[PDB]
Amino acid sequence: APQQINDIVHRTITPLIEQQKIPGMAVAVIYQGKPYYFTWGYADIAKKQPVTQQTLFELGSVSQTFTGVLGGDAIARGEIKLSDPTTKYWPELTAKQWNGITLLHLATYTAGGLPLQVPDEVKSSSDLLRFYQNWQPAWAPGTQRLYANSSIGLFGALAVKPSGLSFEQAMQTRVFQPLKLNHTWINVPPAEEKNYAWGYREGKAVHVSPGALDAEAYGVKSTIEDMARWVQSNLKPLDINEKTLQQGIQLAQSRYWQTGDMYQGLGWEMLDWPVNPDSIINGSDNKIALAARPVKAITPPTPAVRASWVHKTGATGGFGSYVAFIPEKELGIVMLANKNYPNPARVDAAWQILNALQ
């Protein structure tokens, strides 16, 4: 591995692991289109299993980048349109507050303040219908962005309805297989459990619990190798053979709304490059303050901009993940850890590393 990459990665990540007390971590840097891997610590403390390039980590919200691309692929196939009303794909949603709420609003968190989480008491499909039917928006659609798993989650479920496939089968067949993400799962099979890291929360080993729309909002578990491959696909969609998938990746990176220095895509969020860490943090999902932010529509959406810092942060109770890439520099990074540590620290480390390799 080029010593420059070796040095900046280790000199940045070692202090990070030390300061955040992270049990295990895997990092991939994509430089000029090739991946370089790094791992530290334990996937399982009690059983002393080390983190390897084959260890599976829960991606949490980073899963939404896959959901966003899968929806983009569905648009490309002519199965759905972002301008179509939510009720076109769920006619049972008759409550009037849904008038005017489109698939675009669901995918981009601008439906009017859908909740951060679907409540635990929501199990069945009838329970889910009840939940959305009873929800009362605080705002008109397309006026404010409020990050929400119940918004992108619903988008994922509806986007695959025309296909006739379950969300997982659609994801496997249309995204994972074509890109050869052969160790990426929504449900980890028994044969792969030996590689599934435990997450750690307050010192206790934990895995994400089942919940409504979990597959769509936070259900992916993946290895550092598959995630590096996911970043390469997103860096260079033109290299992808499947037409609708190539188009779908491009649609997920288009800029639909702007708030401050940030642009909202489908799953991915973007800022113009160059930009410093403080601005990225202020213009993004920060685990800390949950913010309602007014948005300006980009009419029509700007196609993916090469000079962008494209990223997504994610977490589950015991895992913290971060992905960021800059298309015009063919540069990217993935950081997977089995501890949910502060987002600002993730952005600071990713920026320190990618800034150094410009």
In this structure, what CATH number is given to the domain that contains residue 134? 3.40.710.10
Number of Cβ within a 10 Å radius of residue 337: 30
Q: Establish whether 308 is an annotated binding residue.
A: no
CA distance 263 to 271: 6
4 marked among binding-site residues:
no
Residue 233 designated active-site: no
Buried b (16+ CB within 10 A) or exposed e, 286-317: beeeeeeeebeeeeebbebbeebbbbbbbbbb
How many whole angstroms separate alpha carbon 145 and alpha carbon 108? 7
In order of 198, 257, 271, 299, the CA distances from 139 in angstroms are 39, 16, 25, 20
Under a CB-based contact definition with an 8 Å cutoff, are residues 286 and 128 in contact? no
User: Of 23, 84, 5, 4, nearest to 337 (Cα)?
Assistant: 23
Q: Return d(Cα 14, Cα 27) in angstroms, integer.
A: 11
Query: How far is the CA of 284 from the CAs of 59, 269, 332, in angstroms?
Result: 17, 8, 18
Length of the chain: 358
Picking from 328, 102, 130, the residue whose alpha carbon sits closest to that of residue 236 is: 328
Counted domains in the chain: 1
Q: How far is the C-alpha of 225 from the C-alpha of 146, rounded, in Å?
A: 32
Strands (E), 86-232: 144-145, 199-201, 204-206, 221-222
Q: State residue 49 phi and psi, 5-degree precision.
A: -85, 125
Question: Is 182 known to sit in a ligand binding site?
Answer: no
312: Cα separation from own chain's centroid: 5
Query: Among all chains, which residue has been given the structure tokens 């598959």?
Result: 226
Q: What are phi and psi of 303, to 5 degrees?
A: -60, 155
Helix, coil or strand: residue 341 = coil
3-class DSSP state of 14 = helix
- Would the annotation count 234 as a binding residue? no
- Work out whether the CA dihedral 232, 237, 241, 244 comes out positive or negative: positive
Task: Give the range of the structural domain holding residue 198, as residue numbers without chain letter.
Answer: 1-358
Cβ within 8 Å of residue 103, ≥6 positions away: 71, 80, 81, 82, 83, 84, 86, 89, 155, 158, 159
How many CB atoms are closer than 10 A to CB 322?
24
